[PDB]
């Protein structure tokens, strides 16, 4: 009932619209040269991380 109440109020729609408004500054992340190596140093999995 409650999540449909925020629907009939339109609060989920405000949530979604705020999503794309916030999207107006988020730079594209740099994903590293060897994107698997990027994520690997990210999770710390290669030797020494």
């Amino acid at each position: 009932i409650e999540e449909n109440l925020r629907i009939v109020h339109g609060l989920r729609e405000k949530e979604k619209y705020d999503f794309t408004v916030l999207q107006r500054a988020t730079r594209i992340p740099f994903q590293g040269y060897d994107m698997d190596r990027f994520l690997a140093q990210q999770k710390g999995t290669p030797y020494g991380a």
């Binding site: 999207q23 988020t26 594209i28 992340p29 994903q31 060897d34 994107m35 698997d36």
Partner: peptide, 20 residues
């Protein structure tokens, strides 16, 4: 030849430009 395309262009929902 986009790298890690099978997770980025194919399976990353927002095409890798959108941060969820």
């Amino acid at each position: 030849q986009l790298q890690s395309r099978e997770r980025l262009i194919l399976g990353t929902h927002g095409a890798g430009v959108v941060q969820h």
